[PDB]
Structure 1
Amino acid sequence: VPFVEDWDLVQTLGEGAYGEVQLAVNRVTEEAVAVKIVDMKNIKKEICINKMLNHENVVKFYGHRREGNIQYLFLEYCSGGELFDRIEPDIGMPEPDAQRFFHQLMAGVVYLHGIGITHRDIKPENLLLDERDNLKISDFGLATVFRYNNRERLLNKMCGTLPYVAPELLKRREFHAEPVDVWSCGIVLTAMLAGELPWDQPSDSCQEYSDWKEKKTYLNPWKKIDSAPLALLHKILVENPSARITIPDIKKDRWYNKPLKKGA
């Protein structure tokens, strides 16, 4: 069928460092995809990782075409946009909605970690929603292999987003990858349930961070969060990444398993 590889770029979905992500609609089928435009004048690795990914809570990769200097990455389109725009400032969102998004977040992260991949920059800006509000992890531009041939590699590159970074990345030369993603997922949860981020960064100089370690949960964001999800956050946002809760244990947490939401 003629024309079936022609795509009209119809709308900018986002504009980072690389360039842009455009909504693309097929000339013939009208299938909608997201196309990432990355002017190579680092993405080879983003593509490399994207080729490994196949899961319902991970933005699917379809393929890429290079034309001269620009690379075109063809990616699953998520019509619900970014989790960020479901978080009402200072309020957050209804707890059953946060729990469902957190469930889906975990399934995605479990998957990635299973294939030896760390995202390194989980935040509501990078967590996308499809037409049925299913969450999908996006943007693998900072992602990296932390396990290959069943051997773990400790990380050392400082990367991610300060309010979402785990404290070890600021304090230690090297660190395990998985606890960093678990930590960012907890800050995402906090934001979902409080509509505010708890600190500019998790350093002992950061007053809001010291207060959290001092267990001042009569202060915001923590006062807004119910005891049950707050109890989970006390297990996730633990300074020592060796003592921090693992994802298999997050799946056993009382809040995680609390019935709250009716089906679609």
Structure 2
Amino acid sequence: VPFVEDWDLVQTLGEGGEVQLAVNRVTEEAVAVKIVDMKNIKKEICINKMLNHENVVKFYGHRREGNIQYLFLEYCSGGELFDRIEPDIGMPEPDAQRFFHQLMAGVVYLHGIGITHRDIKPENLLLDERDNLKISDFGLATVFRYNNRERLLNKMCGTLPYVAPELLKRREFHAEPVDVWSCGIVLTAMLAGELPWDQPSDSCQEYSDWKEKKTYLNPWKKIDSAPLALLHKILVENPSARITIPDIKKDRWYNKPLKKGAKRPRVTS
């Protein structure tokens, strides 16, 4: 079948290099192509070849043309989770619970194969055509468990409003509680439409107020008591005392019926 390998770079999806929407000449299948001008990528492609989950962006393959590296990834027509968050409002609680369930499935998977994303935020959480959440960008990702032996991290990685406090106060820390904390900050953004603090440090007043349990303040005043009880368990300063994903899965709000299924077409009489 001729021309089946030809893709047209239709439009820009993002920057950093750049991400382009690529449409197949013959089949018209859409993919996102990451254009990386090498003048790191070996690890990124290596981690991407291990990934196969419904809540993780699909890696179709890579092609290298001199100094330009082309990463062929999943096109997600729902765009970014970031653009579903209304500033200072957020989104309806049932939508946030469904996206948080899908985010947990994706992070469970990753941790299961010993991968830590290290930069979970709404900019990196993409939505497919049926609004299924997908974890994207393994540029900062790394192997924290190999041959069933855990390796402690020491490197500063992430985005300050989403990083766990141990990453700023300890030399070494465990990988999994760091991804749990960023998921908790994502849940806060989804239910309040604002970030609670610039960084989880004691010099940050908003962060001190949260440790002082001043929940009558923003963003916590906008969040219902059931998801707020969960956030109280996730945004715990001590990474050893922090809730683990198996226990998030037992939380009362996480298992609270709120959301209806996708609305299938119906007729009466």
Q: In the TM superposition, what is the alpha-carbon distance from 1:35 to its structure 2 partner?
A: 0.4
Residue 7 of structure 1 is matched in structure 2 by 7
Question: What is the DSSP-based 3-state SS (H/G/I as helix, E as strand, rest coil) of the residue aligned with 2:253?
Answer: coil
**Alpha-carbon distance in structure 1 between the residues aligned to 2:104 and 2:148:** 22
TM-score (norm 2): 0.97
Q: In the TM superposition, what is the alpha-carbon distance from 1:49 to its structure 2 partner?
A: 0.2
Residue 114 of structure 1 is matched in structure 2 by 112
Encode CA deviations 1:139-161: one digit per residue, 9 max, x unaligned: 00000000000000000000100
Encode CA deviations 1:26-84: one digit per residue, 9 max, x unaligned: 00000000000001111111100000000000001000000011110000110111100
Encode CA deviations 1:160-181: one digit per residue, 9 max, x unaligned: 0000000000000000000000
**Alpha-carbon distance in structure 1 between the residues aligned to 2:127 and 2:121:** 13
- Structure 2: runs of 5 or more not aligned: 263-269
Runs (4 or more) in structure 1 with deviation over 3 Å come to none
Q: In the TM superposition, what is the alpha-carbon distance from 1:243 to its structure 2 partner?
A: 0.2
Q: In the TM superposition, what is the alpha-carbon distance from 1:205 to its structure 2 partner?
A: 0.4
Question: Are residues 1:151 and 2:163 paired?
Answer: no
Question: What is the DSSP-based 3-state SS (H/G/I as helix, E as strand, rest coil) of the residue aligned with 2:254?
Answer: coil
**Alpha-carbon distance in structure 1 between the residues aligned to 2:256 and 2:112:** 25
Residue 33 of structure 2 is matched in structure 1 by 35
Question: What is the DSSP-based 3-state SS (H/G/I as helix, E as strand, rest coil) of the residue aligned with 1:131?
Answer: coil
Q: Percent identity?
A: 100
Q: In the TM superposition, what is the alpha-carbon distance from 1:185 to its structure 2 partner?
A: 0.1
Question: What is the DSSP-based 3-state SS (H/G/I as helix, E as strand, rest coil) of the residue aligned with 1:75?
Answer: strand
**Alpha-carbon distance in structure 2 between the residues aligned to 1:202 and 1:9:** 41
Aligned pairs, number: 262
**Alpha-carbon distance in structure 2 between the residues aligned to 1:90 and 1:39:** 37
Encode CA deviations 1:5-28: one digit per residue, 9 max, x unaligned: 000000100001xx0000000000
**Alpha-carbon distance in structure 2 between the residues aligned to 1:158 and 1:149:** 24
Encode CA deviations 1:173-232: one digit per residue, 9 max, x unaligned: 000000000000000000000000000000010100000000000000000000000000
**Alpha-carbon distance in structure 1 between the residues aligned to 2:126 and 2:113:** 21
Q: In the TM superposition, what is the alpha-carbon distance from 1:94 to its structure 2 partner?
A: 0.1
Encode CA deviations 1:59-117: one digit per residue, 9 max, x unaligned: 01000000011110000110111100000000000000000000000000000000000
**Alpha-carbon distance in structure 1 between the residues aligned to 2:32 and 2:65:** 17
Question: What is the DSSP-based 3-state SS (H/G/I as helix, E as strand, rest coil) of the residue aligned with 2:90?
Answer: coil
Encode CA deviations 1:119-138: one digit per residue, 9 max, x unaligned: 00000000000011000000
**Alpha-carbon distance in structure 2 between the residues aligned to 1:45 and 1:78:** 23
Residue 140 of structure 1 is matched in structure 2 by 138
**Alpha-carbon distance in structure 1 between the residues aligned to 2:23 and 2:69:** 18
**Alpha-carbon distance in structure 2 between the residues aligned to 1:189 and 1:177:** 19
Question: Are residues 1:61 and 2:59 paired?
Answer: yes
Question: What is the DSSP-based 3-state SS (H/G/I as helix, E as strand, rest coil) of the residue aligned with 1:51?
Answer: helix
- Structure 1: runs of 5 or more not aligned: none
**Alpha-carbon distance in structure 2 between the residues aligned to 1:174 and 1:66:** 36
**Alpha-carbon distance in structure 1 between the residues aligned to 2:31 and 2:87:** 30
**Alpha-carbon distance in structure 1 between the residues aligned to 2:124 and 2:220:** 24
**Alpha-carbon distance in structure 2 between the residues aligned to 1:260 and 1:75:** 33
Question: What is the DSSP-based 3-state SS (H/G/I as helix, E as strand, rest coil) of the residue aligned with 1:4?
Answer: coil
Question: What is the DSSP-based 3-state SS (H/G/I as helix, E as strand, rest coil) of the residue aligned with 1:109?
Answer: helix
Question: What is the DSSP-based 3-state SS (H/G/I as helix, E as strand, rest coil) of the residue aligned with 1:3?
Answer: coil
The structure 1 residue matched to 2:76, chosen from 68, 75, 78, is 78
Residue 228 of structure 1 is matched in structure 2 by 226
RMSD: 0.3
**Alpha-carbon distance in structure 1 between the residues aligned to 2:144 and 2:97:** 28
**Alpha-carbon distance in structure 2 between the residues aligned to 1:83 and 1:226:** 21
Residue 218 of structure 1 is matched in structure 2 by 216
The structure 1 residue matched to 2:45, chosen from 41, 44, 47, is 47
**Alpha-carbon distance in structure 1 between the residues aligned to 2:180 and 2:247:** 11
